Amino acid sequence: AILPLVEELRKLLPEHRLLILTGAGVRARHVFSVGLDLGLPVGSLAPLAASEAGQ
Amino acid sequence: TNSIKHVISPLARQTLQDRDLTRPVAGKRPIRLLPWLQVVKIGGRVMDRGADAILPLVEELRKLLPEHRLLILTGAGVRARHVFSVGLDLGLPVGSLAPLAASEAGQNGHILAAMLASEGVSYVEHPTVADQLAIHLSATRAVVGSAFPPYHHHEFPGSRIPPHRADTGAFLLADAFGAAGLTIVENVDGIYTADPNGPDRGQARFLPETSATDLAKSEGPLPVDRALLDVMATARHIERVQVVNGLVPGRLTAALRGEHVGTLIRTGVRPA
Amino acid sequence: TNSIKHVISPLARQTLQDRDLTRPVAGKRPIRLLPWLQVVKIGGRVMDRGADAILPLVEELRKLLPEHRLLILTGAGVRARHVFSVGLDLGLPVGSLAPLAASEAGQNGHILAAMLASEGVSYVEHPTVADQLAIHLSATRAVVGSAFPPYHHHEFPGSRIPPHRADTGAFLLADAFGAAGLTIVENVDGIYTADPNGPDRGQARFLPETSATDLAKSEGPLPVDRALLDVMATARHIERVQVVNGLVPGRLTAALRGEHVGTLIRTGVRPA
Amino acid sequence: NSTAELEELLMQRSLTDPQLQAAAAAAADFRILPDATVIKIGGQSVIDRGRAAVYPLVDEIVAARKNHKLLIGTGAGTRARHLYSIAAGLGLPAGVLAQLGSSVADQNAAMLGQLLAKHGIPVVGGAGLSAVPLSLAEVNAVVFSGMPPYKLWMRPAAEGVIPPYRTDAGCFLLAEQFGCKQMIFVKDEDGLYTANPKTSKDATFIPRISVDEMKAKGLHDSILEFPVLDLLQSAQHVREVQVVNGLVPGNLTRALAGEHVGTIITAS
Amino acid sequence: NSTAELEELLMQRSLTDPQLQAAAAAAADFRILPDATVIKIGGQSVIDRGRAAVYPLVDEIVAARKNHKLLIGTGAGTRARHLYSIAAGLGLPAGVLAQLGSSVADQNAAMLGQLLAKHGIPVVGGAGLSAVPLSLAEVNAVVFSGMPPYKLWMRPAAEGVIPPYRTDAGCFLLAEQFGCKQMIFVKDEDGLYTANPKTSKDATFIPRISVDEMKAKGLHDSILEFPVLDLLQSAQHVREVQVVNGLVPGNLTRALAGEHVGTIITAS
Ligand SMILES: Nc1ncnc2c1ncn2[C@@H]1O[C@H](COP(=O)(O)OP(=O)(O)OP(=O)(O)O)[C@@H](O)[C@H]1O
Ligand SMILES: Nc1ncnc2c1ncn2[C@@H]1O[C@H](COP(=O)(O)OP(=O)(O)OP(=O)(O)O)[C@@H](O)[C@H]1O
Ligand SMILES: Nc1ncnc2c1ncn2[C@@H]1O[C@H](COP(=O)(O)OP(=O)(O)O)[C@@H](O)[C@H]1O
Ligand SMILES: Nc1ncnc2c1ncn2[C@@H]1O[C@H](COP(=O)(O)OP(=O)(O)O)[C@@H](O)[C@H]1O
Ligand code: MOO
Ligand SMILES: [Mg+2]
Ligand SMILES: [Mg+2]
Numbered sequence A: 001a002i003l004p005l006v007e008e009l010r011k012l013l014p015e016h017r018l019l020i021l022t023g024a025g026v027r028a029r030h031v032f033s034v035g036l037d038l039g040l041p042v043g044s045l046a047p048l049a050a051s052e053a054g055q
Numbered sequence B, C: 001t002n003s004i005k006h007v008i009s010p011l012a013r014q015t016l017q018d019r020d021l022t023r024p025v026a027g028k029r030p031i032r033l034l035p036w037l038q039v040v041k042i043g044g045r046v047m048d049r050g051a052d053a054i055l056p057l058v059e060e061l062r063k064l065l066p067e068h069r070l071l072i073l074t075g076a077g078v079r080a081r082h083v084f085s086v087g088l089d090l091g092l093p094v095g096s097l098a099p100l101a102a103s104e105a106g107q108n109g110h111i112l113a114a115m116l117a118s119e120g121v122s123y124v125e126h127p128t129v130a131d132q133l134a135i136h137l138s139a140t141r142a143v144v145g146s147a148f149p150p151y152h153h154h155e156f157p158g159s160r161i162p163p164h165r166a167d168t169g170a171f172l173l174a175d176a177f178g179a180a181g182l183t184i185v186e187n188v189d190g191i192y193t194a195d196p197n198g199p200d201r202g203q204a205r206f207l208p209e210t211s212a213t214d215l216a217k218s219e220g221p222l223p224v225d226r227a228l229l230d231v232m233a234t235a236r237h238i239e240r241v242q243v244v245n246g247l248v249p250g251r252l253t254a255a256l257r258g259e260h261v262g263t264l265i266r267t268g269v270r271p272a
Numbered sequence D, E: 001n002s003t004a005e006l007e008e009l010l011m012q013r014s015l016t017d018p019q020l021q022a023a024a025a026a027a028a029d030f031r032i033l034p035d036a037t038v039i040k041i042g043g044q045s046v047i048d049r050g051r052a053a054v055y056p057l058v059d060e061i062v063a064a065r066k067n068h069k070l071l072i073g074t075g076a077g078t079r080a081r082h083l084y085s086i087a088a089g090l091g092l093p094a095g096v097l098a099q100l101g102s103s104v105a106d107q108n109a110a111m112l113g114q115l116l117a118k119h120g121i122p123v124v125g126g127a128g129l130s131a132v133p134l135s136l137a138e139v140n141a142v143v144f145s146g147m148p149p150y151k152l153w154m155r156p157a158a159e160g161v162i163p164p165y166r167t168d169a170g171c172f173l174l175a176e177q178f179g180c181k182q183m184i185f186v187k188d189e190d191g192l193y194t195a196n197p198k199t200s201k202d203a204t205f206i207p208r209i210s211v212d213e214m215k216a217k218g219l220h221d222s223i224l225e226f227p228v229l230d231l232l233q234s235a236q237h238v239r240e241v242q243v244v245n246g247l248v249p250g251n252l253t254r255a256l257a258g259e260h261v262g263t264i265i266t267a268s
C-alpha cells in the first residue's frame, strides 16, 4: 500500500503544497493493550499512541 | 528507376488515411504532458469591463499563484467585433479575420500580464507556449498567453466568423497538455437556455450542468464557441470544463478546487 | 453610409490631441510595474577599459546578486564613435546611426553577461526586456540588456548624433517599470562643471548634487545624455539618479543602498 | 442590405448567435489572389522519389509559370511517417506530432526551392501574401511548406494520435483563403481509385466524383486526406480540386490550363 | 556503382564509413546560383576608410550589376578588432568572439545597403536563395553580412581565441555552397605580396599562386585568412579566388568580366 501511495504523492508534489500527516494504526492498539493492563490513565496513553503516528 | 525512397518504420508506405493500418501504431490514448497544470481562460468581454473587473480578478489571481501552476489565456472581446465589422465590410475571408481577432486576445494578455508583473508573471508567445511552457512554469508560478489558436489563414471556411476562437484554443491546449482542468471565466454565471442579455432574456433559464453533445444539438447562442463543443467530443483527458462568473470574486478560486459554482460542461472523455 | 465605425470607449471619437478631453481618462500617474527592480547602467567607456575595469566590476556585481533584483544595461563606448565617424563620412542620417551605435551597446552586454554566466546571468533582448522581464528575473537574480532604446530609424532629428542613447534608454526603462532606482556607472566620479579630462580640466569643479532642470539650462559637455535630462522632466516615478565611478570598487554597492558616493541628479518627480 | 444590423449584432450578440452568423454570411466576398493557382507537390508520392520525379516537375513548373501564377506547396512523406511512428510509440498527442511533420514539409520546401532559386522562385513564409514574386512575370511563383500552422492546437482525429490535417489540408486551405482559381494535387497515381491501387488490384479509377458521392462509397483509403472533403464542402472560393499524376509528363501543365487529366473532386 | 548501393550504405553504415563516403562522392553536382558572383567588400581595408573608398565602389557596383549577378558580402574591420581585444583580454573563447565580430559585419552591411537602397539592392538575411532580387535585371544584386554563422560553435584556432573563420571564409563558403562562378575579394592592395605591403616595403606583388606554393612560402601575414586556403582546396565549385584593389576604379568591373587584374589563388 505504501509504494503506490508514495508514487501518487510524488506526482502530486508539482501540483499542490502538501502537509502530510500520518495516523497511528495497529501499534497504538498494542500500547493501549499494555497501558490499560498497567492501568495507565488516558493522558498516559495519548502520547504513547502519538509515537506510533510519528514513526 | 522511379521508386519511392522509404524510411523503414511502422507507418512506412502508408497514406495514414487507412484506420486499420494506422491503429496498431497510433490508435491509443496519448499520455499527459503537464498533468499538474491548471488552465484558466479569461473572457475578452471580462477584460473589456476595465479596472472594475480586472482589478478584483488580478487580486484573486495573485492569491492563486502560491496554490496552482497556472496558464492564463485571454480572449478577444469587443475589439475583435470591430475588426470583424471593418474586415467584413472590406469583404475579407475568414482566414483573414482570424489573426486579426487573435491580436485583440494577445493585447488583453499583455494588459493582464502587466498587472501581475510584480509577481513574476509575463505574457508568453504561442511558440513559447507550444514548445517551452514547462521551463517557464519552472521559472515562475504563472504565465499569460493568447487563448486564440494560431490557425490564421488556415482557419476553417464555412462561417464568415472565425470558428476556432479563445474557448476552443484554450481547450485544445489544455487537453493536449493533459492538464488538470480548464476553467472558463465569463461575464455571466454560466450557460442559460437563451442569451441572458439578449432579446429573449426573460426566457433564459440557467443550466447548472450539461454535456457538450447536448449543447451541440442545440440551436441558439452560447457563451462559449460552438467549436469548443466539437473539440470536446474528441477530447482525450479533460472530463469537465466549468464556466464561472469572473465578476463574482471567489468563484474562480472555488472552481479551481472543484467546487460547482457555475455551469459544468461534460466532455466526451470516458471516466472510469 | 461613410461614417466612422467606432468602438464604444471612454476615448472613442477623440483624436487624443485634446488634452482636456483625454485627462479624465488618462491624466493619472501610472502604477509601478516592477517596484522591486534595481536598474544599473554600465557606461560603454567603462567596458572599453577592458579586464582592468571589467573584472573588478564583475566581482562587485557578483556580490550584489543576492542583494538586489538587477537589470544591468550596457552603454556603447568608443566603438559607436567609430561607426559615427564612418556613417557621418557616408552622410547617413541620424536614424541610420542610432541602431549602428546601439549594436555596440548590445555587444558590451554580451561581453558582460558572459563573465557572469556561471552565476546564471544571461543577455536578454529588447523584446524580452519589454514584455518578459518579470519571468526572467524570477528565473535568475539578474539579466543584462542593451541600454540603448529601440528607436532605430525613428530616432528624433535635429542633431546628427543620435540623442536617445544609453543613459536615456536606461532611464526610460527604469521609470516605465517604476523601478526602485537607476544607478549610472561612469568612468569618473560624477558630473563636473567642465570636462575633467578635457582642455578646461583645471577649472572642472565636482557637483555632488544637481537638478536635471539646472543641467538642462547648462551649456557644455556632460557625462550623461542631454536627452536624459529631458526625459527626467517627464519622469513619473524615479526621483533621483546617481552617477558613480565604476572604477572605484564599492561605489556601485553603496549607490544601490542610497549612499551618496557620486553625483545625485534630481528628476522632475517632486517627492512628497 | 444593412451593415447597420450586422454591426449592431456584432456588438450586442455572441458570435455564436445564429442571427449574427447569418448577417455575416451576407458580407461581400473578396478574393485576395484570384489569378493564382495552388499546387501541392507530393511528399511521399513525389519528392520522396527524388530526382526521377522532382527534376521533370521542376522543368514543368519553370515552363508553366510563364502562363500561370503558382503557389507551390510541399508534402512531407516517409520521414514524417517515421517521426509519427516514434512519437506515437511514446503516446505523444496529435498536437506534438503535428509540429514534427511540419519540419519534414519544411525540408522538402527547402530542397525544391534550391532547385528553383536560379529561376527566381523563392521559398516563402507567407506565400499568398508574398505579393511581389507572384506579381512579377519574371517570377510568378513561390514555394511554401504545406503543413498547417496548428501545431499543439491541432484538432485530433476521433481515434489515434495521427494529425488529421496535414499537407493536403495545408495546401487546400491556402488556396481557399486567398481565393485562388484552382487547386491541383500532384501525386503519383492517375487519380482517385476505389482503394489504394498499390495494394488492391481490383481498385477501379474514379475520374470525377462529388464529396457526397465519395462519402457514400465509404472508402477505407484515399489519395487525399478525408477531412479535406469537408473543408471542400465548406469552402467559399475553391469548390473543386483535381488530383493528377505528376509522373506523367505534361499532366500538371494540362491541368493548369483547365484540362481534366486526373480526378476532379467537386464540393457539389 | 549505383544509387541502390548508396542508399543501402546510407541506412546500414555509419556516416564515417569510407564506403559510404565514396558512394556519396559519386552523386551528381547541382549548382544553385551558377551565374552569380560573390564579392567581399573589405571591412578594415575598404569600409573602414569611409566615403573616399565606399562611394566609388558603390557606383561601380550599380554599374556592374547591369551585366553581373552579385552577392555582396561585407567585412568587419577595426571595430571587430577592438571587440576581439576586449573579449580576449577577459579570456573569452573563440565562440564568444565570433558573435561579437558578426555584429560589426552586420553594421557594415547596413551602411552599404542604405547607400544601395535607392538602386533597389537590398540587405538580405538570405542572399543565396534570395532568388527574386538576383532574378531581376533591375536589381541583380544583394548585400549580406560576411561573417559565418558558427557563433558559439566556432571551431577555435590551434592557438589563441581569435576566431579563425571570419569574413573571408564567410563569403567564400557562400560562393562555394551556391556553386557561384567566381569569388572576388575587394580590398586595398593590388593583391597578395610576399609580405605585408604596409609594414614591409621590400614586398613584391604575387600575380598568381597555388595553395601548395603559398603554404610552401611560409608567409607571416596574408591578405586572406589562412584557413580559407584549406577550404579552397576542399571546395567543389569555387576552385580559385581573386583579390583585387578596390581603391583603383575599374578593378572590380574587370575582375567581374573574368579579367585577371589582381592576385589569383588556385586550389591546384
Ligand atoms: N446561452 C447563453 N448563456 C449565457 N450567455 C450567453 C448565451 N448566449 C449568449 N450569451 C451572451 O454571451 C456573453 C459572453 O460573450 P462572449 O462569450 O462573446 O465573450 P467572451 O467569452 O468574454 O469573449 P471571448 O470569446 O473573445 O473571450 C454573455 O454576456 C451573454 O450575454
Ligand atoms: N561635465 C562633465 N562632467 C564629468 N565628465 C564629463 C563632463 N563633460 C564631459 N565629460 C567626460 O565624459 C566622459 C564619459 O563619456 P561618456 O559618458 O560618453 O561615456 P559612457 O557614458 O561610458 O558611454 P555610453 O554613453 O556609450 O555608455 C568622462 O570620462 C568625462 O571625461
Ligand atoms: N483510393 C485511392 N485512390 C488513389 N490513391 C490512393 C487511394 N488510397 C491510397 N492511395 C495512395 O495514396 C498515395 C498518395 O498519398 P500520400 O502517400 O500521402 O502522398 P502525399 O505525401 O503526396 O500526400 C498514392 O501513392 C496512392 O498509392
Ligand atoms: N602578404 C600580404 N599580401 C598582401 N596584403 C597583405 C599581406 N599580409 C597582410 N596584408 C594586408 O592585409 C590587408 C587586408 O586584410 P584585412 O586588414 O583583414 O582587411 P579585410 O577587413 O578586408 O579582411 C591589406 O590591407 C594588406 O595590407
Ligand atoms: O506526409 Mo504527411 O505529414 O501525411 O502530409
Ligand atoms: Mg498524404
Ligand atoms: Mg464566452
Ligand SMILES: [Mg+2]
Residues within 6 Å of the ligand: C015
Ligand atoms: Mg491620430
Ligand SMILES: [Mg+2]
Residues within 6 Å of the ligand: C043, C167, C186, C223, C224, C225
Ligand atoms: Mg556617460
